[PDB]
Amino acid sequence: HHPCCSNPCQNRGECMSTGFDQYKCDCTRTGFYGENCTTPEFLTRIKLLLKPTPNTVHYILTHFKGVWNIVNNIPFLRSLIMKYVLTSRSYLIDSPPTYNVHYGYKSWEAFSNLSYYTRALPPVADDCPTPMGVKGNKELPDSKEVLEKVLLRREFIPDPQGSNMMFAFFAQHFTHQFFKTDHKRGPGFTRGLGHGVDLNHIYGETLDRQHKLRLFKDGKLKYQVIGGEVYPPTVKDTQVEMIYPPHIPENLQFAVGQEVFGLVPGLMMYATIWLREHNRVCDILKQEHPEWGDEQLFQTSRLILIGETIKIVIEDYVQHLSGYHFKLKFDPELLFNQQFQYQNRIASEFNTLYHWHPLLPDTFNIEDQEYSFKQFLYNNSILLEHGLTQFVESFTRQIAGRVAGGRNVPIAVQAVAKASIDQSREMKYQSLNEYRKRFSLKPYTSFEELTGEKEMAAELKALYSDIDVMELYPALLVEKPRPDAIFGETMVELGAPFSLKGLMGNPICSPQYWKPSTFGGEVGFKIINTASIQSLICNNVKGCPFTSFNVQ
Amino acid sequence: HHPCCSNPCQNRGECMSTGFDQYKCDCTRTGFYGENCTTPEFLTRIKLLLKPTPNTVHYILTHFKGVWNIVNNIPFLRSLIMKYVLTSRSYLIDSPPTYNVHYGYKSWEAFSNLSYYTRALPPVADDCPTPMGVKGNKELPDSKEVLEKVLLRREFIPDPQGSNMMFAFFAQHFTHQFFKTDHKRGPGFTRGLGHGVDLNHIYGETLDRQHKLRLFKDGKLKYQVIGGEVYPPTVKDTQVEMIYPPHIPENLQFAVGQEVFGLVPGLMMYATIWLREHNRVCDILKQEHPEWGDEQLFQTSRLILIGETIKIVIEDYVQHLSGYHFKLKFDPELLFNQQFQYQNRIASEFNTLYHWHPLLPDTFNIEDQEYSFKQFLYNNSILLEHGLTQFVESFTRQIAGRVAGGRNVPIAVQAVAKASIDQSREMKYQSLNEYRKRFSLKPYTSFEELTGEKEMAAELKALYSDIDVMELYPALLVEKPRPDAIFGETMVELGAPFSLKGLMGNPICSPQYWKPSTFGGEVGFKIINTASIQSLICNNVKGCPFTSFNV
Ligand code: COH
Ligand code: COH
Ligand SMILES: *[C@@H]1O[C@H](CO)[C@@H](O[C@@H]2O[C@H](CO)[C@@H](O[C@H]3O[C@H](CO)[C@@H](O)[C@H](O)[C@@H]3O)[C@H](O)[C@H]2NC(C)=O)[C@H](O)[C@H]1NC(C)=O
Ligand SMILES: *[C@@H]1O[C@H](CO)[C@@H](O[C@@H]2O[C@H](CO)[C@@H](O)[C@H](O)[C@H]2NC(C)=O)[C@H](O)[C@H]1NC(C)=O
Ligand SMILES: *[C@@H]1O[C@H](CO)[C@@H](O[C@@H]2O[C@H](CO)[C@@H](O)[C@H](O)[C@H]2NC(C)=O)[C@H](O)[C@H]1NC(C)=O
Ligand SMILES: *[C@@H]1O[C@H](CO)[C@@H](O[C@@H]2O[C@H](CO)[C@@H](O)[C@H](O)[C@H]2NC(C)=O)[C@H](O)[C@H]1NC(C)=O
Ligand SMILES: CCCCC/C=C\C/C=C\C/C=C\C/C=C\CCCC(=O)O
Ligand SMILES: CCCCC/C=C\C/C=C\C/C=C\C/C=C\CCCC(=O)O
Ligand SMILES: CCCCCCCCO[C@@H]1O[C@H](CO)[C@@H](O)[C@H](O)[C@H]1O
Ligand SMILES: CCCCCCCCO[C@@H]1O[C@H](CO)[C@@H](O)[C@H](O)[C@H]1O
Ligand SMILES: *[C@@H]1O[C@H](CO)[C@@H](O)[C@H](O)[C@H]1NC(C)=O
Ligand SMILES: *[C@@H]1O[C@H](CO)[C@@H](O)[C@H](O)[C@H]1NC(C)=O
C-alpha cells in the first residue's frame, strides 16, 4: 500500500513516496523541519507560544460589549480589526488550488479542470489498509447506524442563537449558486464553473439560459404579474428547463437561474426578491443613464447585485452566525495593501460542512397555517396564496434548528444526511482529526471531548473505536457547540476561511474593479455599500415588512 | 455619438457616459484628479520627477558590461535587480482582467468568458465619428497602401542582434500555445482557454485529445520510430485531428498537441524535440519512483516541462531579445514577499504585437538546400530527409530579419501582414499613441519621431495625416529601433508586461506549487532549474549539436 497512508507529514508538510515502502515529507515554508515536519523552527516556537486558541479569540469577540461598542464606532479601529479578521483566516486556503478527488498530488489536470470541486486535503489513497489510512477497523460503521444513533432528530432542538427561517432559506438560496453537484459525474464534480458568487442562481450558468431569462429591454429579467404581484416567468414562456414534478400547473412552473429552486417556496421567495431587485436596479440605472442600452444596463445591474450579495453575506449573514459584538465590515480596500489572490475554487469539504440540515423545522409555519414537508415541497401555490409580505413576516418569526450538539437532523431528509456520509466515503475523505490539524486545531483525544457529553460519545466509541477515525460530516453535527451557539469550533474554523476566499476573492473586490465607474457611477456604488437584508426586503416586498436573520 | 469617443480621461482614468452628450472620469487610485485626471497629486509629482524613461533604463542595462559582470556574480544583487525588473512590469496589466472586443465597460460576461482574448484598452465605440475616435479622417488609409509603402521587404534586413532560425521557430512554437484565434467566432476570440503556458501545443487542449496522444505506459506520449529516430505518431495511429492539405500522405501526417504544427517543418522540429523531452523526463522519474503509475508519471512530467519552458523563455529567449548585460533569472521566490496575482488572461494586443513576420527569411537554408516558402510549407519530408541534427545546425547559423525599422515583411506572407492591420481595425483598436500612454510612454509628436527617418515618415503622413491616429501594428514594424536592436521602444514596453505576467502568473510559480515534491522530489525540481535551450537540444537530438538563439 501507499507509504503515505498513515498521513505521516505534519504541519502542512507534503507526503511523497520515494519507493514502495518509503516516504519523504516536503517541509518547505511550513516553519517546521525534520522527518515528519514536527521540529519547529525558533521563530515558529515563539509564534506558537504567542498564538491564542480559536476558543479564546471567540470568547473575546463574544464578550466585553462595552469595549466593542467603542471599537465599532471608531472607523479606524473597526477597519484595523476587520483587516486582522480577513488576513488571519486567509493563509489557510491553497490558492491557486491543488488537490481534488482524483489527484492526491498536484497536477495540471487538477489545476485546470473546473468541473472538479477542489480538496483541502488529498483523498486517502485507494490501496490503504483502512478507510482512513492505517487506523481503525477494516470497515467504517454502517452509515445508517451513525445516522440513527447520533444524527436523527428525536425532539426539535431550537437554535439558541435565534436563527430564523429567513436565515435558513437565505443560506440555502445563497450557497446553491456554488454548491451544484454534477450527479451525472459524481459527488466530487460541480456544475458551478464560476466557483463562487457569480449569481448564476439568478442569471443562469450558461449564456443560453441567461438570454432565455432576459427581457432584452431596459436591462431587465423577464417576469409575470399575478394578482398585481411580480413573479418569475414560466418554463413555457421562457423555454428555461426547471426540475418540477409532472403534476405542477403551468403558471406555477416558475423559471429562474437555478434549476432546482422550484423545490421549495422558501427558495422561490428569495428568487422572486432578487429578480425584483435586479429590475429595480435597472430602473435606477436607466434614470442615471438614459443613453445606455439594454446590454450595459443588464451587465451593470448584475455587478451591483453581486456587490449587494457580498455586502449582505458579510455584514448581516456572517455577522449573525458569528455571534460577535464586533461589527464585521465589507470593504475590499482593507486588502489593497495586503497579499491576496482574487480567485477561488470551491472545495468539496466546504460543500460537506454546509449540509446544515438540522436548520430545518418540523413544520413550515406561514400565517395561521403549519405545513408539513410533503405539503411544502414543490408547492409554489403556498407562496402565491400567502404572498411575499406574509412569507417574510412568518419566516422572520419562526425559529430554526441547532446544527451542532447532535440529534437534530429532521427525519424527512434522513436520506440526504445519509448521502453526505456515504459520499464523503466515496470521495475518500481523511478523518475529522486530520481536518482539525489542517486548520490549526488540536486533534480531539476522545469522543467525550468531541461531544462534551456521555451518551452520544459512548455510541460513537462503540461505532468507530478510535477518535482518530471519526468522520468529518457526522462530527460537525454532534460537536459540542460554543456556549449558546449554533456551531462547534470545527464548523467555524473550516467554514470561515472558505467563506472569506469565496467572498473577498471575487473580481469585483479587486482594485481595478472596486471603483464607482464599474457600477455605473456613485449611485450604483452606493446601492452596494448600503445594502442590507432589511433594505433588500424593504425595496422589493409590498409593505416593507421588518426582517432579520434572528427571531429575537 | 458616444461621449467617450475622444478618450478624454488620462493616466488610467476610466471614462463613463453621463447622459447623451457628457462624460465623467473616474480617477480612483490613478494618482491624479480633475475632470480628465490630469492634475497630479503631490506624491505623484515627486514620483514623476525621479522616474527615469524606458530609454535611459535600456541604456543602463545595455552598457557598463564590466559593472554587470560583477553584478551577475553577486547572487543577492542579481536577485534584487531581477525583483525590480519583475515588479516594475507588474502594475501595468489588469489582473483580474477587464475589457474585451465586445465590452468597453467591465462586465461579468467579460470577466468570466474565457473564449475571449482580453483587452488592455477598451475598443473604440461603434458610433464614433472616426475609426480612432474623433481624430483623423472618416476612413483609415487603405491597408494595402500601408503594407506596400512601409511594411513589405525590398532587400532582406538581417537582425543586428543576430537572432537565428532557432529563435524564430521557438517564438512561433512557444506563442502558438496561447495565441490560437478561434476564426469561427472572430479575431477577438481564442481556443487557448488555459490562457498561458500549459503546454497544450504538446499535450492537446482537451482531455480527449491528450488521451489519444498518450501511450498510457510509463507516463509517456505515443511516438513512432523512423530510421532509428523518434518522431510524433501519425493521425492514422492516434485519430488525432490535424490541419493538413489533402495531398499530404498518411505517413507524413504527424499528430501533435497543436493542430497547426504540421504546416511548418520548423514547428515540427520543436514538436519532436519536446515530445522527446517529455518521454526522457518520464524515464528519469520512473527510476526515481519505481512505485509510481502511468498517470502520476505523465502529470509530473507535464509540470516539469512547464517549468523547463518558463526557465528557457526567461533565461535564454527573453535574455537574447533584451540585449541586456544583466543576467535575467527565473526565480518564483522573488515574488513571495510581493503583491502579485497568480493568474493570467491573454490580451488581444499581446497577440497583435507578436506578429513578428519580418523575422522570416527569404529562403530556409538547411544543409546545402535553400527552400522557398512554397517548398517549405506543409513539407515534413524535409525534416525526415535532413534529420533533426542538421535542422538544428542549419537553423542555428541562419540569421532572422529585423522586426522594427520598417520594410522587412517578406512578400510571401503579405496577406497575413494585411490581415493583422485589417483585424486590428475590425476589433476597433485604439491608436498607437493611446496604447503608448496606456503603458506610461510619451505620445509621438510626429511620424519622423516614430520612424527616426524621413522617407517612411513622409509616406505615413500622407496616408494618416495625424500622428494621433497612427495604428499600433504597422507602427511596431516601422518604429525606430533601439541602437542595433531588433525592436523599438513600443514593442518592448508593451510586450514585457504581458510576457512576465504569462510566465510568473503560472500556478507552478505560486508558493504552494513551487516545492520539490510538486515535481517528484529534488531531481525533478533540478531539471526545471537547470533547463536551457542548449540542454533541451543536447538531451534530445542525436550528436548534441551546439545551439543558441543567436548567430
Ligand atoms: C444551507 C442549509 C440547507 C438547507 C436549509 C437545506 C434544505 C433542504 C430541503 C428543505 C427545504 C430539502 C428538501 C433539501 C434536500 C436536498 N439537499 Co439541502 N439544504 C441545505 C444545504 C444543502 C447543501 C449545501 C447541499 C449540497 C448541494 C449540492 O452539492 O448540489 C444540499 C443537498 C441537497 C439535496 C441533493 C443535491 C441536489 O440534488 O441538488 C437534496 C435533495 N443541501 N435540502
Ligand atoms: C512569433 C513569430 C512568428 C513567426 C516566426 C511566424 C511564422 C509564420 C510562417 C512561417 C513559418 C508562416 C507561413 C506564417 C503564417 C501565418 N501566421 Co505567423 N508567425 C509568427 C507569429 C504569429 C502569431 C503570434 C499569429 C497569431 C496566431 C493566432 O492568433 O492564432 C500568426 C498568425 C499566422 C497566420 C494566420 C492568419 C491570421 O489571420 O492570423 C498565418 C497564415 N503568426 N507565420
Ligand atoms: C474534467 O475531468 C472529467 C473527469 O475526468 C472529464 O470527464 C471525462 O472525460 C473523458 C474524456 O473526454 C471521458 O472518457 C471518455 O473517453 C472514451 C471515449 O473514446 C471512453 O473510454 C469513455 O467511455 C468516455 O466516453 C469520461 O467519461 C469523463 N469522465 C466523467 C464524465 O466523469 C472532463 O472531460 C474534464 N473536462 C475537461 C474540460 O477536460
Ligand atoms: C515520523 O513518523 C513515523 C511514522 O509515523 C515515526 O515512526 C513511528 O514512531 C513511533 C514512536 O513514537 C512508533 O510508535 C511507531 O512504531 C513508528 N511507526 C512506524 C511505522 O515507523 C517516526 O519515528 C517519525 N520520525 C521522527 C523523526 O519523529
Ligand atoms: C478635459 O478634456 C476636455 C476634452 O478634451 C476639454 O474640453 C475641451 O477642451 C478644448 C480645448 O480647451 C476645447 O476646445 C473643447 O471645446 C473642449 N471639448 C469638449 C468640452 O468636449 C477640457 O478642457 C478638459 N478639462 C480640464 C479641466 O482640463
Ligand atoms: C462566450 O461568448 C461567446 C460569444 O457571445 C458565446 O458564443 C455564443 O453563444 C451563443 C448562445 O449560446 C450562440 O448563439 C452563438 O453561436 C455564440 N456566438 C459566437 C460563437 O460568437 C459563448 O457561448 C460564451 N461562452 C460561455 C461559456 O458562455
Ligand atoms: C473571513 C471572512 C469573514 C470572516 C468571518 C469571521 C468569523 C465567521 C464566524 C462564523 C462563521 C460560521 C460558520 C462558517 C461556515 C460557513 C460560512 C458561511 C458564509 C459563506 O457561505 O460564505
Ligand atoms: C502569454 C504568457 C507567456 C508569456 C510570454 C513570454 C515571452 C514573450 C517574450 C517577449 C515579448 C516581447 C517583447 C519583450 C521582450 C524583451 C524585452 C525584455 C523584457 C524584460 O526585460 O522583462
Ligand atoms: C428518533 C429518530 C430515529 C431514531 C432511531 C432509533 C435508533 C436507536 O438509537 C438510540 O436512541 C436512543 C434514544 O435517543 C439513545 O438513547 C441511544 O443512545 C441510541 O442508541
Ligand atoms: C520586390 C517587391 C518589394 C515591394 C515594394 C513595394 C511595391 C509592392 O508592389 C506590390 O507587391 C505585391 C507583392 O509583390 C504584389 O502582390 C502587388 O501586385 C504589387 O503591386
Ligand atoms: C399546496 O399548498 C396548498 C395551499 O397553497 C394546499 O392546499 C395543498 O394541500 C398543497 N398541495 C399539496 C400536494 O400538499
Ligand atoms: C517537399 O520537399 C522535398 C525535399 O525533401 C522536395 O522534393 C519537394 O519538391 C517538396 N514539395 C513541394 C510541393 O514543394
Tab-separated table of C-alpha atoms in Angstrom, chain B residues 44-295:
chain	number	residue	atom	x	y	z
B	44	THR	CA	2.764	61.769	-7.968
B	45	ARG	CA	4.778	64.904	-8.815
B	46	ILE	CA	7.746	63.583	-6.801
B	47	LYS	CA	7.336	60.159	-8.467
B	48	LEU	CA	7.247	61.716	-11.960
B	49	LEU	CA	10.314	63.804	-11.026
B	50	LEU	CA	12.537	60.795	-10.225
B	51	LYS	CA	11.221	58.156	-12.654
B	52	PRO	CA	13.699	57.501	-15.488
B	53	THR	CA	12.372	56.818	-19.001
B	54	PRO	CA	12.350	53.313	-20.535
B	55	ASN	CA	15.034	54.584	-22.954
B	56	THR	CA	17.578	55.528	-20.261
B	57	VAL	CA	16.900	52.331	-18.276
B	58	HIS	CA	17.537	50.381	-21.509
B	59	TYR	CA	20.802	52.294	-21.988
B	60	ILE	CA	21.971	51.410	-18.461
B	61	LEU	CA	21.127	47.716	-18.970
B	62	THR	CA	22.878	47.616	-22.380
B	63	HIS	CA	26.052	49.415	-21.260
B	64	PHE	CA	28.578	49.065	-18.410
B	65	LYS	CA	29.332	45.393	-19.217
B	66	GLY	CA	32.098	45.385	-16.577
B	67	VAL	CA	29.732	46.517	-13.820
B	68	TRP	CA	27.064	43.998	-14.866
B	69	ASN	CA	29.628	41.178	-14.897
B	70	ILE	CA	30.284	41.949	-11.221
B	71	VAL	CA	26.531	42.303	-10.521
B	72	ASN	CA	25.710	38.994	-12.268
B	73	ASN	CA	28.224	37.306	-9.939
B	74	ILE	CA	26.731	38.534	-6.649
B	75	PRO	CA	23.525	36.453	-6.134
B	76	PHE	CA	21.989	38.958	-3.694
B	77	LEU	CA	22.423	41.912	-6.097
B	78	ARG	CA	21.256	39.807	-9.062
B	79	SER	CA	18.144	38.816	-7.071
B	80	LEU	CA	17.431	42.417	-6.013
B	81	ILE	CA	17.713	43.686	-9.598
B	82	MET	CA	15.620	40.833	-11.050
B	83	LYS	CA	12.951	41.607	-8.422
B	84	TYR	CA	12.881	45.254	-9.631
B	85	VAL	CA	12.540	44.077	-13.247
B	86	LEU	CA	9.592	41.843	-12.288
B	87	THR	CA	7.745	44.324	-10.025
B	88	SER	CA	8.053	47.411	-12.264
B	89	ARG	CA	6.456	45.427	-15.126
B	90	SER	CA	3.638	44.184	-12.867
B	91	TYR	CA	1.260	47.096	-12.152
B	92	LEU	CA	0.652	47.664	-15.892
B	93	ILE	CA	-1.657	44.674	-16.502
B	94	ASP	CA	-5.265	44.429	-15.286
B	95	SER	CA	-5.429	41.197	-13.252
B	96	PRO	CA	-8.224	40.018	-12.768
B	97	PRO	CA	-8.815	41.098	-16.406
B	98	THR	CA	-11.305	43.735	-17.558
B	99	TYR	CA	-12.277	44.648	-21.160
B	100	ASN	CA	-12.687	42.634	-24.359
B	101	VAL	CA	-13.748	43.150	-28.009
B	102	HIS	CA	-17.442	43.235	-27.041
B	103	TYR	CA	-17.088	45.050	-23.715
B	104	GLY	CA	-15.762	48.607	-23.393
B	105	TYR	CA	-17.029	48.526	-19.794
B	106	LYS	CA	-16.402	45.962	-17.010
B	107	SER	CA	-18.944	43.112	-17.011
B	108	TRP	CA	-19.326	39.596	-15.648
B	109	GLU	CA	-19.509	38.362	-19.240
B	110	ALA	CA	-16.095	39.885	-19.972
B	111	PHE	CA	-14.602	38.562	-16.725
B	112	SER	CA	-15.995	35.004	-16.889
B	113	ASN	CA	-15.927	34.141	-20.600
B	114	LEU	CA	-12.562	32.512	-21.334
B	115	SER	CA	-13.264	32.274	-25.094
B	116	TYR	CA	-12.335	35.961	-25.395
B	117	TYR	CA	-8.907	37.459	-25.603
B	118	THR	CA	-8.930	40.233	-23.039
B	119	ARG	CA	-8.137	43.879	-23.947
B	120	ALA	CA	-5.565	46.233	-22.407
B	121	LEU	CA	-7.597	49.114	-23.855
B	122	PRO	CA	-11.344	49.003	-24.492
B	123	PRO	CA	-12.483	49.046	-28.133
B	124	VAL	CA	-13.402	52.337	-29.825
B	125	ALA	CA	-17.215	52.675	-29.599
B	126	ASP	CA	-19.283	51.641	-32.653
B	127	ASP	CA	-20.808	55.103	-33.225
B	128	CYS	CA	-17.599	57.169	-33.072
B	129	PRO	CA	-17.264	59.709	-35.951
B	130	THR	CA	-13.789	58.431	-36.946
B	131	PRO	CA	-12.172	54.954	-36.669
B	132	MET	CA	-9.864	56.125	-33.873
B	133	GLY	CA	-12.493	58.179	-32.106
B	134	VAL	CA	-12.785	61.782	-33.139
B	135	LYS	CA	-9.374	62.476	-34.682
B	136	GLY	CA	-8.256	61.834	-38.264
B	137	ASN	CA	-10.224	61.215	-41.450
B	138	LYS	CA	-13.576	59.420	-41.906
B	139	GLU	CA	-11.624	56.375	-43.101
B	140	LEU	CA	-8.198	54.993	-42.247
B	141	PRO	CA	-5.802	54.614	-45.217
B	142	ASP	CA	-6.225	51.537	-47.424
B	143	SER	CA	-4.357	48.780	-45.560
B	144	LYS	CA	-2.865	47.563	-48.872
B	145	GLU	CA	-1.255	51.010	-49.300
B	146	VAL	CA	0.158	50.992	-45.742
B	147	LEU	CA	1.509	47.470	-46.319
B	148	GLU	CA	3.112	48.207	-49.699
B	149	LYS	CA	4.616	51.586	-48.825
B	150	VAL	CA	6.206	50.899	-45.423
B	151	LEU	CA	5.964	47.181	-44.490
B	152	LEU	CA	6.926	44.987	-47.442
B	153	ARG	CA	10.563	43.833	-47.688
B	154	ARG	CA	12.746	45.058	-50.542
B	155	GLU	CA	16.211	43.883	-49.563
B	156	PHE	CA	16.373	41.478	-46.619
B	157	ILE	CA	17.307	43.324	-43.417
B	158	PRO	CA	19.122	40.955	-41.037
B	159	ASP	CA	18.584	41.329	-37.296
B	160	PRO	CA	21.605	43.205	-35.863
B	161	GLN	CA	21.084	41.316	-32.565
B	162	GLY	CA	21.873	38.163	-34.560
B	163	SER	CA	18.611	36.292	-33.945
B	164	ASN	CA	18.609	32.969	-35.789
B	165	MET	CA	16.060	30.465	-37.110
B	166	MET	CA	16.150	28.515	-33.835
B	167	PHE	CA	14.828	31.712	-32.218
B	168	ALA	CA	12.234	32.448	-34.922
B	169	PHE	CA	10.781	28.935	-34.767
B	170	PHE	CA	10.922	28.831	-30.959
B	171	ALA	CA	8.935	32.072	-30.904
B	172	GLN	CA	6.402	30.574	-33.285
B	173	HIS	CA	6.147	27.225	-31.453
B	174	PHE	CA	6.009	28.719	-27.894
B	175	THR	CA	3.459	31.517	-28.525
B	176	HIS	CA	1.096	29.300	-30.535
B	177	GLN	CA	0.083	27.524	-27.335
B	178	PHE	CA	-1.640	30.763	-26.200
B	179	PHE	CA	-2.309	32.583	-29.481
B	180	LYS	CA	-4.958	30.312	-31.032
B	181	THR	CA	-7.534	32.526	-32.674
B	182	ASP	CA	-10.969	30.949	-32.992
B	183	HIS	CA	-11.662	32.056	-36.597
B	184	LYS	CA	-15.136	30.513	-36.335
B	185	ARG	CA	-16.053	33.201	-33.796
B	186	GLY	CA	-13.713	36.028	-34.897
B	187	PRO	CA	-10.296	37.688	-34.326
B	188	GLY	CA	-11.169	38.660	-30.710
B	189	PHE	CA	-11.737	35.043	-29.647
B	190	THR	CA	-9.297	32.298	-28.630
B	191	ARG	CA	-9.265	28.485	-28.395
B	192	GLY	CA	-6.490	28.615	-25.780
B	193	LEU	CA	-8.729	28.505	-22.710
B	194	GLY	CA	-5.778	27.927	-20.359
B	195	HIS	CA	-4.571	31.447	-21.276
B	196	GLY	CA	-0.834	30.795	-20.784
B	197	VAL	CA	1.948	28.249	-20.580
B	198	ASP	CA	0.023	24.991	-20.142
B	199	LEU	CA	1.826	23.196	-22.995
B	200	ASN	CA	-1.460	22.363	-24.760
B	201	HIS	CA	0.565	22.590	-28.014
B	202	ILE	CA	2.308	19.382	-26.858
B	203	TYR	CA	-0.445	17.672	-24.825
B	204	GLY	CA	-3.631	18.902	-26.503
B	205	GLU	CA	-6.216	21.455	-25.424
B	206	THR	CA	-8.847	18.901	-24.326
B	207	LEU	CA	-8.658	15.693	-22.295
B	208	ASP	CA	-9.932	13.595	-25.242
B	209	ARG	CA	-7.037	14.795	-27.415
B	210	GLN	CA	-4.498	14.280	-24.592
B	211	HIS	CA	-5.681	10.711	-24.115
B	212	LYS	CA	-5.348	9.954	-27.855
B	213	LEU	CA	-1.787	11.308	-27.729
B	214	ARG	CA	-0.733	9.295	-24.638
B	215	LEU	CA	0.866	5.844	-24.575
B	216	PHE	CA	-0.649	5.034	-21.126
B	217	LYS	CA	2.596	3.295	-20.267
B	218	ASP	CA	5.360	4.894	-18.152
B	219	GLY	CA	3.652	8.320	-18.346
B	220	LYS	CA	4.754	8.537	-21.986
B	221	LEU	CA	3.408	10.103	-25.172
B	222	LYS	CA	2.848	7.952	-28.277
B	223	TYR	CA	5.590	8.111	-30.903
B	224	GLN	CA	6.959	6.354	-33.983
B	225	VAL	CA	10.480	5.300	-34.947
B	226	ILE	CA	11.708	6.272	-38.424
B	227	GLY	CA	15.271	5.188	-39.280
B	228	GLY	CA	16.104	4.759	-35.597
B	229	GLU	CA	14.812	8.267	-34.830
B	230	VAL	CA	11.844	9.105	-32.588
B	231	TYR	CA	9.081	11.196	-34.184
B	232	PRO	CA	5.466	12.051	-33.242
B	233	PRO	CA	2.840	9.411	-34.137
B	234	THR	CA	0.502	9.686	-37.144
B	235	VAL	CA	-3.072	10.974	-37.438
B	236	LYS	CA	-3.984	7.430	-38.556
B	237	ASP	CA	-2.445	5.888	-35.410
B	238	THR	CA	-3.924	8.379	-32.931
B	239	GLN	CA	-7.216	9.545	-34.509
B	240	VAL	CA	-5.955	12.991	-33.523
B	241	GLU	CA	-7.226	15.677	-35.897
B	242	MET	CA	-4.656	17.873	-37.621
B	243	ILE	CA	-4.736	20.582	-40.309
B	244	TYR	CA	-3.083	19.291	-43.494
B	245	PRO	CA	-3.625	19.897	-47.209
B	246	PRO	CA	-5.393	16.885	-48.856
B	247	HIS	CA	-2.257	15.869	-50.817
B	248	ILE	CA	-0.218	15.141	-47.647
B	249	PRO	CA	0.378	11.358	-47.423
B	250	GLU	CA	-0.763	9.463	-44.305
B	251	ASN	CA	2.803	8.690	-43.165
B	252	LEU	CA	3.606	12.427	-43.213
B	253	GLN	CA	0.555	13.455	-41.188
B	254	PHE	CA	2.269	13.790	-37.793
B	255	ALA	CA	-0.042	14.137	-34.773
B	256	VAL	CA	0.875	16.636	-32.066
B	257	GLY	CA	-0.900	18.721	-29.417
B	258	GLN	CA	-1.331	21.813	-31.606
B	259	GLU	CA	-3.434	21.165	-34.723
B	260	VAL	CA	-1.478	23.570	-36.974
B	261	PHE	CA	2.119	22.445	-36.279
B	262	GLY	CA	2.312	20.085	-39.282
B	263	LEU	CA	2.125	23.078	-41.611
B	264	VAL	CA	5.693	24.273	-40.940
B	265	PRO	CA	8.746	21.914	-40.600
B	266	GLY	CA	10.404	24.327	-38.112
B	267	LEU	CA	7.329	23.823	-35.912
B	268	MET	CA	7.534	20.039	-36.293
B	269	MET	CA	11.220	20.159	-35.256
B	270	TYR	CA	10.286	21.646	-31.857
B	271	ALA	CA	7.222	19.384	-31.512
B	272	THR	CA	9.545	16.397	-31.946
B	273	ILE	CA	12.175	17.802	-29.542
B	274	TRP	CA	9.608	18.463	-26.779
B	275	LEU	CA	7.914	15.081	-27.258
B	276	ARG	CA	11.345	13.502	-26.781
B	277	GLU	CA	11.867	15.720	-23.695
B	278	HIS	CA	8.610	14.534	-22.107
B	279	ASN	CA	9.491	10.841	-22.570
B	280	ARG	CA	13.056	11.463	-21.313
B	281	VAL	CA	11.672	13.050	-18.107
B	282	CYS	CA	9.324	10.051	-17.738
B	283	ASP	CA	12.384	7.777	-17.796
B	284	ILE	CA	14.103	9.831	-15.083
B	285	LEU	CA	11.027	9.949	-12.840
B	286	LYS	CA	10.409	6.201	-13.269
B	287	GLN	CA	13.857	5.405	-11.855
B	288	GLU	CA	13.289	7.950	-9.079
B	289	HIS	CA	9.868	6.420	-8.437
B	290	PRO	CA	9.551	2.731	-9.405
B	291	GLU	CA	6.327	2.723	-7.335
B	292	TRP	CA	4.543	5.347	-9.486
B	293	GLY	CA	1.859	4.576	-12.058
B	294	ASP	CA	1.470	5.916	-15.602
B	295	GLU	CA	-0.880	8.746	-14.616
